[PDB]
């Protein structure tokens, strides 16, 4: 399928233990796929002081429609010192490897894979 239909973990940014996917572009998108498609992913909210607190290059999901299911379409962009790899809508937060960490919600989303 184009689409998968996911309901991510919502960390606090301080809970996270792992604070990134790696070290490329291309790896950190290929990983936050990965972990997509295995369950093993989490959602940051982006709010002021949040980005600093983890590890570029970042993965963010973007609003690329505007919600079948209640699930909200994303797709993933990713960014190293300020350039961003993919164009799409307003932020939904940033993906983190999800290792146990308790969530504060979930965010439900319709992937564009």
Do not use: N, W
């Given at each position: 399928k184009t689409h998968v239909q996911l309901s991510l973990p919502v960390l606090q940014v301080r809970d996270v233990?792992?604070?990134?996917?790696?070290?490329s572009v291309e790896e950190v998108l290929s990983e936050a796929r990965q972990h997509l498609k295995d369950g093993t992913c989490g959602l940051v909210e982006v709010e002021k002081g949040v980005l600093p607190q983890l590890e570029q290059p970042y993965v963010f999901i973007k609003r690329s429609d505007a919600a079948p299911h209640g699930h909200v379409m994303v797709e993933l962009v990713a960014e190293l010192e300020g350039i961003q790899y993919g164009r799409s809508g307003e932020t939904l937060g940033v993906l983190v490897p999800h290792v146990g960490e308790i969530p504060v919600a979930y965010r439900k989303v319709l992937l564009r894979k």
């Amino acid at each position: 399928k184009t689409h998968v239909q996911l309901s991510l973990p919502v960390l606090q940014v301080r809970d996270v233990l792992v604070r990134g996917f790696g070290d490329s572009v291309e790896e950190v998108l290929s990983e936050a796929r990965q972990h997509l498609k295995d369950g093993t992913c989490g959602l940051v909210e982006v709010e002021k002081g949040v980005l600093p607190q983890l590890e570029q290059p970042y993965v963010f999901i973007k609003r690329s429609d505007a919600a079948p299911h209640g699930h909200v379409m994303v797709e993933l962009v990713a960014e190293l010192e300020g350039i961003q790899y993919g164009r799409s809508g307003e932020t939904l937060g940033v993906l983190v490897p999800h290792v146990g960490e308790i969530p504060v919600a979930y965010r439900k989303v319709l992937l564009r894979k």
